[PDB]
Design a protein around this nucleic acid. Structure first.
Ligand SMILES: [Zn+2]
Lengths: 50, 208, 128, 86, 129, 216, 104
RNA sequence: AGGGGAUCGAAGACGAUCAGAUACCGUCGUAGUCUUAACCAUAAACUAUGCCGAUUAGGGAUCGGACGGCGUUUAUUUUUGACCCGUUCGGCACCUUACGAUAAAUCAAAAUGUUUGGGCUCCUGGGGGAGUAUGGUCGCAAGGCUGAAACUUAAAGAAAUUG
């Protein structure tokens, strides 16, 4: 059966570290992420606008 | 009296028409809240409404109707077919917005539905079959007037007119008299003694 | 072999908004759409015209639930004033041999009101 | 009606039901007002003077406003032989 | 079996106020209830009360004027000192500026704010606000 | 951003300015449905978001997450409201939630503990509210005493404008939404308690809607 | 959690009732917790009657139909499809299934 | 311990199914299933809802008693019996609704409780160890009543929602 009895070596499948790798799954961080997105968006636009 | 003069009386002529339309025969099952508007229960059968009581409550209901500045803030409701043509002619003789047929729940609560009106008063033909209309009236601080027989829920109903409420002739005749009385208080009929120039049978239903 | 909402809603708006300008004829209908609409395909354009000709064919004999237009309200309003001269509901004792039938229980109510002067027939109520 | 030195510091003095006397809360959708017009000797309605009644959602929900309306109107002399305390 | 007629009467009154009626019947009559009604009557929390009569316990009928809230009773007759009254008024009263605890003293069945003036004490019977 | 188009009669009338202040709207118990009325007759409103809840909802395709935001507003001088809304992004949720809160705003009565010396500071009476397995009780307090409560329920009281009070809570108080709703209900019912100083009869008047005709 | 307000037996006001034997498996069940079916079936089908009728012993007559009463435990009953599972709200409805008198 | 012992039927023997089948399916069959004279005192002994008393919403059915009434029915008849309409007292239950309650399922009580006190008795304090060990007491025995500790653990559990 190809599912339950993994046939490889368990090697650092840490969801906590992945959260850092991908995106933290917390509401509080997302607001900061949106603020950063707003900050980055303007600088790219102005260069194109200029 | 201290507020009503003596000219507001049943008058013999009106009495024959109202009781000819079979308005004193309705609802074998007696609701407990409509017992005051009962004269005597017939021997081994139906109940009997108090036709005298109708007249005073009818005038009282009329006083409510002629109080709004613009007559456009009065909605008259009916769903069953027997009281649809009569409602439409009421809206024509006076000023009022009418609703016949389906109600489209959300009319009084949703502000993006196309059939959206914000009236200040509601008149209903039957509370049992128009419960949906009353249910929404409970959300926007609007009184309710309705024609009721002796078996009918009376939650959120402020003024109750006792009638047959399910007859062919009865519902039409009552609407006619109410419309006539409103025009009397207004400057239309110009006098309580002169008769009006439309006959009651216009407020009926045609089969095809 | 059945139409969809796109054609039907397009058919619905055109008839409701330009009722006089078109008629039962299928080619005259075919042309008017291409002037008053903005379609990008000949087959869709043809289909909309076809339904309106079917739609107008049935309106001519009785009004339909879906349609509502300015002309309809007043033209109908004209026809709904029928009045019977006899006035059946009017107290019929003066228009036929017999008078009105009531019951003794009702009779007492008139006495309480005092309108006993009015003459009407009274019939007692049997057990069944 | 609080008074530190005779003035009113309360934001607003609410209404009371005419049939039970309970205060009419804010956001109490369900309460309504009834206005009865005043007629003259020959039947016209005089414009601009009017009597007001108030009912609360509490009494409204049971379905007893009708009997309350008879009592209040019969007291103020607007009806005859319509209400009775048996 | 019936063990506190005073509680029975007060319970009937409370029901009407929360349901909104204007009338209550009270089956057993006694001095304590009748005097208890008077203490409210002198403050307007109630209306006119009628006492019927028969050679029996005797019914009472009062009609409710509204403007009345919870009126309870403490079943075990406690002993109150003249100093331990601020504790009881802090215990069961919506606010300080109004409301009344009712006592029984040798000077008659009475309430506080005058027991303080008369410098008396006794036992607790009830309260109303 | 620019001129708003009133969709309701209550909205068109206020824009004209015929009605003096909000209090009368409260007096007549009228439903508000446009958040432009509220911020016109109550500027200087501050808001705070307590927390956003991540919910790993549903399966079969993974879980499609939604986010629920809780916000409350007030002016620290007698007006406070609270609303909750959920959506697919925190930014969308917060903006929509603030609108709901503005609709909910209500007034709060304030009284004196002992003797009255101007500027009421605490509750007139003590009152409680319940919103499911949690009850909150507020009782008056003398001057000088600060607000004694947990951080969550405490924060609301400044926005309502209360200076002195004791608090008490029972049940499972870890459900932040249920706790906040109970406090809101409790503070709301203060105008429903018929104190001795309101027995005096008041006169009934016609509502603003009926006094004058509107504008097309 | 209670699934039925009557516990599925319909007995309130007594200790117990004497049980009975299921007419299919011979299990024992209380007389009130049993599905009962009354049946009035003919001796034979109509097709047989015509052959029976032609060789009539006396004049023209019909052989009398039989009457039966069957009692089932609940587990066997819903395996033979006498009754079947209903919906959460359809459960609390005790009216007999309506029989069409015209069958389309 | 006697009497009685038709029918079913623990234990048990055979026949099948099954890889095995000390069972589910079949044929027999002992104690027992019945009764007389004495023991045992436990059951999902369930409405999983202690007893007495007061107040609170509408309805139609149903059992027993009493009362009032126009009729019908067949009686050595008439009163009475029996059928119909209504009122009332006391029970086994049900339908709609929530002004009320609860976490919810639901409830005319599981209501009248943060605005907390009508009167009285019994029982429980996270899950296991454990209804175990020891002591006492009742019983011919099986057992009943009363009833711990050492030690171990971060969850066990209730109601409802989506798959
Ligand atoms: Zn079976």
């Amino acid at each position: 059966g190809d599912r339950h009895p993994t046939r490889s070596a368990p090697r650092s499948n840490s969801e906590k570290q992945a959260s850092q790798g991908w995106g933290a799954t917390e509401g509080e961080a997302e607001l900061k992420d949106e603020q950063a997105a707003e900050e980055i968006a303007q600088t790219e636009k102005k260069e194109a606008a200029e | 009296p201290a507020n009503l003069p003596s000219i507001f009386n049943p008058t013999s002529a009106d009495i024959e028409q109202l009781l000819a339309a079979q308005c004193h025969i309705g609802s074998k099952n007696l609701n407990v809240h409509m017992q005051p508007y009962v004269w005597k229960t017939r021997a081994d059968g139906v109940n009997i409404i108090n036709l005298g009581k109708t007249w005073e409550k009818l005038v009282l209901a009329a006083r409510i109707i002629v109080a709004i500045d613009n007559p456009s803030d009065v909605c008259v409701i009916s769903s069953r077919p027997f009281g649809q043509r009569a409602v439409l002619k009421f809206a024509a003789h006076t000023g009022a917005q009418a609703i016949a047929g389906r109600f489209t729940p959300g009319s009084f609560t949703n502000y993006i539905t196309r059939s959206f009106k914000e009236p200040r008063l509601i008149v209903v033909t039957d509370p049992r079959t128009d419960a949906q209309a009353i249910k929404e009236a409970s959300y926007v601080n609007i009184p309710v007037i309705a024609l009721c027989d002796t078996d009918s829920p009376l939650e959120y109903v402020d003024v109750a007119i006792p009638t047959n409420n399910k007859g062919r002739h009865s519902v039409g005749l009552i609407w006619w008299m109410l419309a006539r009385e409103v025009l009397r208080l207004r400057g239309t009929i110009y006098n309580r003694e002169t008769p009006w120039d439309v006959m009651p049978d216009l407020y009926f239903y045609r089969d095809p | 072999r059945v139409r969809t909402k796109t054609v039907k809603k397009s058919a619905k708006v055109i008839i409701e908004k330009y009722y006089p300008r078109l008629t039962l004829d299928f080619e005259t209908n075919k042309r008017v759409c291409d002037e008053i609409a903005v379609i990008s395909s000949k087959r869709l354009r043809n289909k909309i015209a076809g339904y309106t000709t079917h739609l107008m064919k049935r309106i001519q004999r009785g009004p339909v639930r879906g349609i509502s237009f300015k002309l309809q309200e007043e033209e109908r309003e004209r026809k709904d004033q029928y009045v019977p001269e006899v006035s059946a509901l009017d107290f019929h004792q003066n228009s036929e041999t017999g008078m009105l039938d009531i019951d003794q229980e009702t009779k007492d109510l008139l006495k309480h009101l005092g309108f006993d002067s009015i003459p009407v027939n009274v019939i007692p109520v049997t057990q069944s | 009606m609080e008074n530190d030195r005779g003035e009113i510091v309360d934001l607003y003095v609410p209404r009371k039901c005419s049939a039970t006397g309970r205060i009419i809360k804010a956001k109490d959708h369900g309460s309504c007002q009834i206005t009865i017009a005043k007629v003259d000797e020959n039947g016209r309605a005089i414009q601009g003077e009017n009597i007001i009644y108030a009912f609360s959602g509490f009494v409204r929900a049971m379905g007893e406003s009708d009997d309350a309306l008879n009592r209040l109107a019969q007291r103020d002399g607007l009806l005859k032989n319509v209400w009775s305390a048996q | 079996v019936r063990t506190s007629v005073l509680h029975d009467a007060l319970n009937s009154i409370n029901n009407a106020e929360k349901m909104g009626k204007r009338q209550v019947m009270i089956r057993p009559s006694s001095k304590v209830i009748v005097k208890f009604l008077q203490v409210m009557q002198r403050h307007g929390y109630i209306g006119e009360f009628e006492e019927v009569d028969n050679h029996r316990s005797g019914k009472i009928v009062v009609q409710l004027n509204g403007r009345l809230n919870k009126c309870g009773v403490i079943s075990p007759r406690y002993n109150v000192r003249l100093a331990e009254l601020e504790k009881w008024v802090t215990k069961l009263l919506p606010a300080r500026q109004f409301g009344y605890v009712i006592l029984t003293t040798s000077a008659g069945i009475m309430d506080h704010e005058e027991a303080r003036r008369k410098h008396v004490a006794g036992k607790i019977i009830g309260f109303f606000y | 951003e620019k001129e708003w188009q009133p969709v309701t009669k209550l909205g068109r009338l206020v824009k004209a300015g015929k009605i003096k202040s909000m209090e009368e709207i409260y007096l007549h118990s009228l439903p508000i449905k446009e958040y432009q009325i509220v911020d016109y007759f109550l500027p200087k409103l501050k808001d705070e978001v307590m927390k956003i809840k991540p919910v790993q909802k549903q399966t079969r395709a993974g879980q499609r997450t939604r986010f629920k935001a809780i916000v409350l507003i007030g002016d620290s001088d007698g007006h406070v409201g609270l609303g909750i809304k959920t959506s697919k992004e925190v930014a969308t949720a917060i903006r929509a939630a603030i609108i709901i809160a503005k609709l909910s705003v209500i007034p709060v009565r304030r009284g004196y503990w002992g003797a009255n010396l101007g500027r009421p500071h605490s509750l007139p009476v003590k009152q409680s509210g319940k919103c499911g397995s949690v009850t909150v009780r507020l009782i008056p307090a003398p001057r000088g005493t600060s607000l004694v409560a947990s951080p969550a329920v405490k924060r609301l009281l400044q926005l309502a404008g209360i200076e002195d009070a004791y608090t008490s809570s029972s049940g499972s108080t870890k459900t932040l939404e249920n706790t906040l709703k109970a406090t809101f209900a409790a503070v709301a019912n203060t105008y429903g308690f018929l104190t001795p100083n309101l027995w005096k009869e008041t006169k009934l008047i016609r509502s603003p809607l009926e006094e004058y005709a509107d504008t097309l | 959690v209670k699934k039925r307000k009557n516990n599925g037996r319909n007995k309130k006001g007594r200790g117990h009732v004497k049980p009975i034997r299921c007419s299919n498996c011979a299990r024992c069940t209380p007389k009130d917790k049993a599905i009962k079916r009354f049946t009035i079936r003919n001796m034979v089908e109509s097709a047989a009657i015509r052959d029976i009728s032609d060789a009539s012993v006396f004049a023209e007559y019909t052989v009398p139909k039989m009457y039966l009463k069957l009692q089932y435990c609940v587990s066997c009953a819903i395996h033979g499809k006498i009754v079947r599972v209903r919906s959460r709200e359809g459960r609390r409805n005790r009216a007999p299934p309506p029989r069409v008198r015209y069958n389309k």
